[PDB]
Amino acid sequence: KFYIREPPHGSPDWLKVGLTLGTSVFLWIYLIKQHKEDVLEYKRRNGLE
Amino acid sequence: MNPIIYTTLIMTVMSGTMLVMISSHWLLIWIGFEMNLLAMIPVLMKNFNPRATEAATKYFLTQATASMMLMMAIIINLLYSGQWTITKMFNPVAMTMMTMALAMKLGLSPFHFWVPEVTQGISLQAGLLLLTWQKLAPLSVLCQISQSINPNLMLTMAMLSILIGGWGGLNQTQLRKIMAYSSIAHMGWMTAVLPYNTTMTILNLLIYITMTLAMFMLLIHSSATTTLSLSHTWNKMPVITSLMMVTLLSMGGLPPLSGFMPKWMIIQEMTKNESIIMPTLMAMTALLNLYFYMRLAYSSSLTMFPSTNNMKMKWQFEHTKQMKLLPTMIVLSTLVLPMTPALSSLN
Amino acid sequence: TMMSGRPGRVPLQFLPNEARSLPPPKLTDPRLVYMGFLGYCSGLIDNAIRRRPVVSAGLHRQLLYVTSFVFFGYYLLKRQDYMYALRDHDMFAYVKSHPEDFPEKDKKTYGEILEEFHPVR
Amino acid sequence: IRLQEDPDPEDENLYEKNPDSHGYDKDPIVDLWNMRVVFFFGFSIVLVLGSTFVAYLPDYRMQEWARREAERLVKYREANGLPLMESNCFDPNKIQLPE
Amino acid sequence: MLKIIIPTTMLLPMTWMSKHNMIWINATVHSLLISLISLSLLNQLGENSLNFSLTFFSDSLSAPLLVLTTWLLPLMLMASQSHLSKETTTRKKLYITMLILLQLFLIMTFTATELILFYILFEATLVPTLIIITRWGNQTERLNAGLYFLFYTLAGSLPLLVALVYIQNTTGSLNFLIIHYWSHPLSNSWSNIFMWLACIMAFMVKMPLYGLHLWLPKAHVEAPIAGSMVLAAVLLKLGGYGMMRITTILNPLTNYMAYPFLMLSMWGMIMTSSICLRQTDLKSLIAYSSVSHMALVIVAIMIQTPWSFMGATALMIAHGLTSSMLFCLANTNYERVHSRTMILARGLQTLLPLMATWWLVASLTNLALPPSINLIGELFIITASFSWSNITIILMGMNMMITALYSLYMLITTQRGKYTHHINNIKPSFTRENALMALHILPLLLLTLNPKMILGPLY
Amino acid sequence: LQYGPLAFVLGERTTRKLTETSKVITVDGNICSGKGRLAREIAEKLGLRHFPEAGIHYADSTTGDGKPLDVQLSGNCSLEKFYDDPKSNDGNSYRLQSWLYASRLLQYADALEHLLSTGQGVVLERSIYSDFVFLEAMYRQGFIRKQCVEHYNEVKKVTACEYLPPHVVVYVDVPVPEIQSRIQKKGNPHEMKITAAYLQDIENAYKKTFLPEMSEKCEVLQYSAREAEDAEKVVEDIEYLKCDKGPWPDQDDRTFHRLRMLVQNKLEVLNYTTIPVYLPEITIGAHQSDRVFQKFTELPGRKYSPGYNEDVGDKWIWLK
């Protein structure tokens, strides 16, 4: 208890932490799925495979 | 001002600009301009004082005159063509009137005095919103009507804007007037490239908006409105001074920063059309802007001006309000040169 | 304006259906890596401005910065590649359609070509 | 007076606090190791190894190859009575003058 | 070239993550390692350059300059150790970051394969130098020096950008290989004259040329030791490299437009040597000597003969090393007595023998004592100028005489005579300073032993 | 959450929390009087919160740990030196006066924030409105200069034009000889070195300027020492007075919201206290400023934001 006043950022905002981690994971998985779908669509359209 | 009223007025300004940018009817575009001005005046007069009232009065007079000229041009175009759709105007006199009205709205020379006057009169947030949005809209109108623009008149106004901005920025000491003259010079560059590539115009608009947002938000963070007030920032938060210095370097067109990309692309586009003298003069004239940018950077970052005694209490206390997207605007205004070919996406 | 008004252009469409015939950018693209680097720099600048340990505080928000920049950069790269492909397609089509405006020229060897010699002295 | 300014400090001498100072740092151990790494790396590694590397760099400029080719051409030319140096670099038969 | 580029971009995070008392050690060690790695670029071919990729290529002209830059970085680090003892950790790291960024930009500028990328990087080098000067200079005139430097460079270089974009639109590509193979003669018209003027004037302002050179004394006198070392040794050679690169597309108009610049350069050699004869400041003397040597390089490039390019390259390398050594010696003397006046401190040979030896060697190399590469380059340039015309020999002879005069004058003034009685803070020379001088001087003698590595691509 | 436009939209209105005892009872008084005891008595009886008189280490107290900092890092002024050598050539007198004015402005901002966020009244021993009496006393004796007076006036105007007026000049009118007797009895040598003319100038400034000025704005309740001994009479008089004085009757919810936003941001409160006016007494050289700032950053719990200092025991830094 160094500070006489409780700092606004004294404790982690677990709601914000969870939202940030979930958003990052969701964006990464969505990007990977979109890339896979784009690769498959390109191959199908151009007849490569 | 009530927060609900303030956000309603801001949304009304944005809705007027959106109506201008999405309307295919001259009457609807004029309506959008009128709504934008009407909702913009209280934003200027938020912090009530005689200087703010005078700035709002001058802004209202200028915008009302420009709107009357624009409506006259619309009526003249309707007389000789009977068309309301915004396309290549069918009458040279109407086109000249429209160009003059839009130049007056933007702030191009010789219609530039109200820009520093109002910018000094109003606060930092009001100046930021004014510059950004009130230059965003008429540039959209000009891009829509680009193919009928008289190149001689447009380039004359652009070069005059560049020269006047450079000299005014050289002589001024107030931060808001410096920002106003910088805006004048950048609008001159944009309107110079306008009759050749609206894509380059939009690219310059985006880069200028990003840099202006970064600079104004840094000034708001440091709570400085003069050169000497900014000269004390190094003793409280030296990071902000360094960020402001790199932003000022970028705004001057120095490579390899983001500000060099619009000038480079504009020079390339203009020299594609067998125009060399205009790009050469425009490039040489930006040295005045870089000079007053560097002079401002000397007083804040590269040297240490004397401080005061209550700055110790300033150190003891901490900044509370957090700026939104400030790091993103700082990064985008200095480190996006290797991403230049995205102008094809912007096309 | 050059590209606007092109026939078949659907307004307010970031990526039309014809853009899916092009190779999507690789996830290891140097441009994507540079976008992630910009995101990381923005996170560091955020820490510096808000007066937090620059390299050790706010790891979750730094990761969010990097992820958002990578996502937007990927979509921007897709649009840029589509636009350049469209430009090349239109150029080749016009060259094919106007052979009299784009004619083939005779290729003379340097033995046949006469060029002036300027001594350096 | 015009400011509350600190007086100009006297310059510190590294030899006062450390007679064996190498001039790199005021900390004795850090100074000693800075001197050691500078001397070792720079002098030994860079000078000696780079000098011998440059001395024994392979002959990619083809100086010796050019000398051998010149010797071969001179021998062939003077053995058959041909001029040592040709009059023209290219073939007048292949060159078509404009006329 | 990525094997050299990436280690610098790794020097940056290493510097920012190293401990407070290990920054100098880490930076010096890894800069020396990077220099050793960059030594491999000296294995050039005889006919065509080394084309690593579509973006970077190395030539017999680029390789010695890259080696010089990578070798010059750790010496600047040592000098910064010397003069930045009381600075804070963050500011010291910022100074090292500026030096690292400048080195990286110089490497990319020298290895760039296209003229527009070359211009972008060659202008990008301005920011770190301006920051270093105007932030860590010691006197009031540093702001004015920075302004003069920046605006001279930009006023020179903007028409170069206009000319480059025009050339790309006209021809198709700015790639150096393409513009060399597809080169066509330049007609004698006003438009071609002005394009020639744009390009040449940009590189001449960078060089500098006599009459466009005041920024050089202003910036070199007021800059810190590392800034002076990088300004004189490498940043002055950007103009020479550009001229040796850009003149491919300017013929035969260069045979007609070279007269004003040749006369300016020769009379500038004479005038700047005469100025060196009567200078009360040591740094100003060194700066004007640099101006004279760069004017000689200008003469070589403008006469543009195969014997003049080799001399130009050799003289550029030799002058860079010699000027860096001279600036280091002057900075040591300044840090001892806190004044740049030359006649203030005397008897320094009595007080400091080894520094007197270093001064003697540096002044002998400055006046082109055979068989040093300074003399090799100067003699090649003189022979080419003699072939060009037979009065250039007179001008070169008088310039050489005055050069020897002022070099030995500064040596005798600083080192010989009776020591100043009231100066009693002349401490013995540091091992760091002695090692700095030795590392400056030994490569000169080694390049004298092996001179074919710095004679350019026309060897 | 933190107060702001979102809270105002949601409905956190200041006039809702206001009551009859929600009054900023500044108690203005004289030197070495029973004003401190009287203020403490008034605060307890009326249920209000008492603010001890503002000072250098009061400004040091609110931030970080409550313990005071070194005088070099905070204030750079001392009251003892002003007592020992009032006319010293280092400008300590005006430096102390400006620092004390800044401290009182900060204290008034804190009191306004507490009142507008809790509805409880506040009792201040002295305020920025009555702080000019010391400046006038110094100027009459020649301790400070006309330039110092002008700078103080400019700062006072631009910084006190914003906040609401005080509530009562409880002028504990003690004659100067009695003040000197009390000072002698207290036994502190530094205050024993106070001259009689300096004490008279403060009383002249109070009675001729401050008392007439605040009479128009609000009621002024003047009491002698014996009258101030009976705090119940003072409380009864305070509760009795009722009128349309001051801007408080016409204060609105929007004005209260603006005032609360202003007072909750301390850097905006202390914004014009460092205007670029280069008086030799307050101007600090660049090198000294840099060195002192480096020391202040080297302080234990002040290098980063409060929630991000590992050396004072902050955890979860990487997730915060």
Ligand SMILES: CCCCCCCCCCCCCCCCCC(=O)OC[C@H](COP(=O)([O-])OCC(O)COP(=O)([O-])OC[C@@H](COC(=O)CCCCCCCCCCCCCCCCC)OC(=O)CCCCCCCCCCCCCCCCC)OC(=O)CCCCCCCCCCCCCCCCC
């Ligand atoms: C892979 C390589 C990538 C290289 C990228 C290079 C470009 C980066 C651009 C973005 C940089 C963001 C920096 C944010 C601010 C940080 C400031 C700070 O305190 O930093 C200290 C901070 C820790 O100290 P602290 O105690 O937390 O902070 C102390 C306080 O600041 C309290 O200290 P104070 O307040 O007492 O300090 C006073 C200082 C306060 O002022 C500053 O510190 C401002 C410094 C400049 C920040 C703004 C830069 C904006 C962009 C400029 C771009 C120019 C061209 C760059 C071209 C780059 C080409 C590659 O002000 C002054 O000294 C006044 C005079 C100022 C003179 C002019 C300074 C500005 C020059 C402008 C150019 C600078 C370029 C380099 C900047 C590097 C910054 C770290 O360390 C870092 O930030 C280190 C960052 C880098 C390493 C991160 C860890 C990496 C570990 C894994 C490595 C893996 C490698 C392979 C994979 C790589 C994947 C990415």
Ligand SMILES: CCCCCCCCCCCCCCCCC[C@@H](O)O[C@H](CO[C@H](O)CCCCCCCCCCCCCCC)COP(=O)(O)OCC[N+](C)(C)C
């Ligand atoms: C640093 C400055 C750049 C800032 C970048 C951020 C600016 C805001 C970006 C917002 C992106 C929103 C995309 C979401 C879908 C929008 C779809 C629609 O609105 O626009 C589409 C795409 O158009 C957008 O303008 C393209 C968005 C490109 C955003 C990045 C621009 C980068 C410019 C180069 C800067 C260097 C890169 C820096 C890294 C970003 C289709 O437009 P379309 O109706 O059919 O064409 C006619 C309209 N005209 C007249 C304007 C042409």
Ligand SMILES: CCCCCCCCCCCCCCCCC[C@@H](O)O[C@H](CO[C@H](O)CCCCCCCCCCCCCCC)COP(=O)(O)OCC[N+](C)(C)C
């Ligand atoms: C003692 C007094 C000294 C001062 C006075 C001098 C008096 C004369 C002293 C002479 C001493 C040396 C004589 C014996 C020389 C033996 C070595 C010499 O023969 O080799 C030279 C070679 O020396 C090296 O090449 C010198 C290296 C120079 C480069 C060093 C760079 C180190 C990094 C520093 C970077 C500096 C950057 C500067 C820009 C590049 C010449 O090349 P070469 O004879 O055929 O090599 C033979 C190998 N072969 C047969 C396979 C070809």
Ligand SMILES: CCCCCCCCCCCCCCCCCC(=O)OC[C@H](COP(=O)(O)OCCN)OC(=O)CCCCCCCCCCCCCCCCC
């Ligand atoms: C269009 C505008 C979008 C703005 C999004 C961000 C919110 C508004 C601005 C807030 C101030 C900026 C700095 C934010 C970080 C520092 C403050 C902090 O601690 O924020 C905590 C917050 C936690 O994250 P969380 O609440 O989970 O956000 C996702 C919710 N769905 O942390 C965050 O939310 C961090 C978010 C970082 C976002 C960076 C900016 C967007 C970058 C997108 C990539 C493209 C960039 C190019 C330009 C835009 C193109 C569309």
Ligand SMILES: Nc1ncnc2c1ncn2[C@@H]1O[C@H](COP(=O)(O)OP(=O)(O)O)[C@@H](O)[C@H]1O
């Ligand atoms: N603005 C000011 N300028 C100079 N000195 C001040 C100022 N305000 C307060 N002081 C000093 O603070 C001290 C406060 O003492 P005080 O609290 O009145 O004593 P007591 O607690 O016995 O009533 C006084 O001695 C006075 O000199």
